[model samples]
Target: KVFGRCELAAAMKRHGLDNYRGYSLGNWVCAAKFESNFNTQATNRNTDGSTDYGILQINSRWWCNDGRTPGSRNLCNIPCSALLSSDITASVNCAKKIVSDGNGMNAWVAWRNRCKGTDVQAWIRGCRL
Candidate 1:
């Protein structure tokens, strides 16, 4: 297989949520729109107060509560490279699980309150499912 760009659309065929393309696409769009706006290489510093992650905007530790520390090399056992793994969909799906169950907007609203001013800037502007 190729190093990163694998044509696994077939693999994704049945692995999507409920086998519904719209739902699955919504997950992808949600992940793409909010996480990094299709920026596969996106990364965010924890702000010393957040547990979000790259593209998928995942906080595996928070969601999983594995007690190892999400994205931690030794604690969580998730190598940093996994965060930057070329498999863009993996990152997105991971976050999708959290959002779907935890209510995506709830998490987002909580995080948004941390912003100080009305002036907000992000790549997900005007994005919708």
Candidate 2:
């Protein structure tokens, strides 16, 4: 939540995530912005009892668990609450696993709707990466 595009990019790169699952850095950055406004503590509950967690807004139906949502896949093997922290490492790692499991960034509805085929250069334009 505290990071802007520049800081987010630097942190991702430092974590060796400049590129993940064949997706460009811009794709990741764009997705993060739309998904949770870069807020690591973000959480949204869906009508289907599933909840999204963290910066990537990873879903409980197929990813982490909040111990309340039923039939959680917990593919990330992490607690959903864990993703709600300032440290984004866990969220980043989980998102990579998701991109591998699905089709790149398309797994995220936000990315497919807003970022796909868009010019995301502006997302990292001033990052100086």
Candidate 3:
């Protein structure tokens, strides 16, 4: 489920995320790079026991449910498996909802750790559009 930067950018554009919610394409790309390295099937387990899902590495603690984890708010109302797909339509939709809820990219630890407050334009370098 490895995704090319251009393809990911294009999908985000189609999903109205290229510059939606005041976040730029580079921010998304940079966040995704750090989150899952653009791998759609990526999943990470945190020491706190919550799991992160997909290219954006959204946490299961609030955004999605895996059934194994109890008390998931499932705010995004999606099965965690939905995010782990090569087709990112579901992923972008959920991410848009997450950002719209006022967290912005701060909802993602990867964004905070790697892409926050940084000049992210280089993330899209060499990719046409």
Candidate 4:
């Protein structure tokens, strides 16, 4: 599903990460891995059956300045690197503080404990990935 795994792999190398092991690098890619298969172009409908949004699962309302609506007007239709830039680390950190502080790696813990098996829980459950 990764359009240019080599490109991403090289980027990860530049960032000093080995690979998408879903645990290291504070598991930022863990969430992204399970959430979008590293596809920055991917979109998804929420469990509530509305609001299909962009990579990193950022909702349209949360991303857009004026909150574009009607199910297809999100603004973050950009690459994952665009969102993960060091310039925006403060923004990401703020959001993370609100949703997952200190140990912002529970998803990795969950995947390691219960989702990394032969069945692949996300594959069976149709989760964000």
Which number leads on lDDT? Answer: 3
- Runs in model 1 deviating more than 4 A are 1-24, 49-51, 60-77, 109-129
**Candidate 1 lDDT, tens digit per residue, 1-129?**
122112222223334632342233333334344455444456554654435555455554454222345453233335433655556455445545555664543455433443223333332234331
The TM-scores, one per candidate, come to 0.45, 0.94, 0.92, 0.38
Candidate models: Cα lDDT each: 0.42, 0.85, 0.86, 0.39
List the RMSD of every prediction in angstroms. Answer: 8.5, 1.1, 1.3, 9.3
lDDT of 2 by residue, 38-105 (tens): 88888898999899988889999888878888877889999889898888889988887888884778
Ranking by TM-score: 2, 3, 1, 4
Q: Name the top TM-score candidate.
A: 2
Q: What lDDT tens digits, residue by residue, belong to model 4 across residues 37-108?
A: 566555654564433222244544434322334454423444323443423332243334323433334423
- List candidate 4 stretches off by more than 4 Å: 1-23, 47-52, 63-66, 69-129
* Candidate 3 structure quality by residue, lDDT tens digits, 54-78: 9888888898888877677999898
**RMSD of model 4 against the true structure:** 9.3
CA error at residue 99 for candidate 4, angstroms: 6.9
